[PDB]
Design a protein around this ligand. Structure first.
Ligand SMILES: Cc1ncc(CO)c(C=O)c1O
Ligand SMILES: Cc1ncc(CO)c(C=O)c1O
Lengths: 263, 261
């Protein structure tokens, strides 16, 4: 009874008509690892707000709710192996998103969910809808099987520890459970992998640049190796090396926007 | 002029975009991309899938968004390499006015800009094109139903339809590619440039697969920015559409599926 398109992933996040970020850099990343995917956009702008202008807004909680729901009526989740979340637009979309996911596993009990808590940074955090960090903790976390937060996106989520690598691992540890299997804490110059029992600390050297999307690149390359048979740490180390690569090529290319080189 | 450290592209395709599916940019951008051509696609509507299904969600982009989007590309300075711009299924009519305006602007720094326009019609849509868009296109691809309403003329033969195309050429509008499916169905196409008339035909399969045109166009343009002579290009892109459909036929897909280049 299957003749409708099918896909591995159902990545839900930001989409730009200009710039490398959100599904506008992740989908191409995915496709390269030989994988099908569906991009359900949360917001739909012109460019990145951090630019100088930027137009467009967020997809309404009635359209965006239809999209996901559509992928189920169309029956294209026959080969679904994962769902990933990125830049959100409203804590209501996040609630919506959850309800959808929650119904999912009852058919895809082996579903992989991967959330990226897009909320803060060093300059200043919560540079997003203030309501998002609550929606994250109350709704979209009790499902994640492995999240990729950073030192500050982790402080907000746990209401816990700070700048001590240990304090961090602790806080991460306090997050694991039956559903959450792992956690990739960042601050990418130092990346700690905290498994349900074990700890790995990968570390490379990052260059200076205001390019946005690496997070989306990284995460993308991460679900790729994981949905391809790579071990956790092994997988991470690759999605991370890849992003350092990607960044060189655009610096070499002299372009304030990411550029997906070959495979 | 100093180098532009921003993203660039040859086309600025403008039409629909479906989360699930193969219509509009959702199939254009890929088709384009295959011929090794960069492109900025500007949405017009954002629907779950195409309306011709049991169910579909979404609507049409806010004028303001739809505008800022356009204005954007420029404030970002990512058009130095542009050469074309192609319309597609439009949500409103105001959009066209705006899309026009913008074009009007662009057309001042890019005198060699080829504007292709598909009269995706089948309420107010007629006029907006007549008044705002039509007067700008350097080429268009309406079918019989589309050429009839866009000229207000009727035409059930070569001469008739032809004269119509002729009755739309000018100092800006250069050619007029018309198409029809006679029925199963045939491809029946006619290339009505001002100084000549070509008519290419093909035998096509029987399907409910949409997007063939968006693709065809998507391809047509590509082959055109590659210095391929019109008529020649028109054929190829026609051929392309069939090839891809066969490919999809085999895989038995209810949506289109791009093979290799
Ligand atoms: C459009 C868009 N996409 C993705 C991100 C996060 O990388 C941001 C962060 O501000 C954004 O604005
Ligand atoms: C949304 C949408 N976009 C484009 C087309 C024509 O390719 C159709 C044809 O029905 C459509 O419904």
């Amino acid at each position: 009874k299957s003749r409708a398109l099918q896909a591995d992933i159902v990545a839900v996040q930001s989409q730009v008509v200009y710039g490398s970020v959100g599904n506008s850099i992740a989908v191409p990343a995915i496709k390269q690892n030989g994988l099908n995917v569906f991009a359900v956009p949360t917001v739909l702008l012109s460019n990145t707000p951090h630019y100088d202008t930027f137009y467009g807004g967020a997809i309404p909680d009635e359209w965006f709710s239809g999209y996901l729901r559509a992928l189920q009526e169309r029956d294209a989740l026959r080969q679904l192996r994962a769902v990933t979340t990125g830049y959100m637009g409203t804590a209501s979309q996040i609630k919506i998103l959850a309800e959808w996911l929650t119904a999912l596993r009852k058919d895809h009990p082996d579903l992989l969910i991967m959330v990226d808590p897009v909320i803060g940074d060093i300059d200043s955090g919560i540079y997003v809808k203030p309501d998002l960090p609550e929606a994250y903790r109350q709704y979209l976390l009790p499902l994640a099987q492995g999240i990729t937060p950073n030192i500050f996106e982790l402080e907000i989520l746990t209401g816990k520890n700070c700048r001590d690598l240990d304090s961090a691992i602790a806080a991460a540890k306090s997050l694991l459970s039956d559903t959450l299997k792992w956690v990739v804490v960042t601050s990418e110059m130092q990346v700690v992998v905290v498994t349900a029992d074990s700890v790995n600390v990968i570390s490379h050297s990052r260059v200076k640049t205001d390019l946005k999307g690496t997070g989306d690149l990284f995460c993308a390359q991460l679900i790729s190796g994981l949905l391809k048979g790579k071990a956790l740490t092994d997988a991470v180390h690759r999605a991370g090396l890849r992003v350092l690569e990607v960044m060189r090529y655009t610096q070499q290319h002299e372009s304030d926007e990411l550029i997906l080189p070959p495979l």
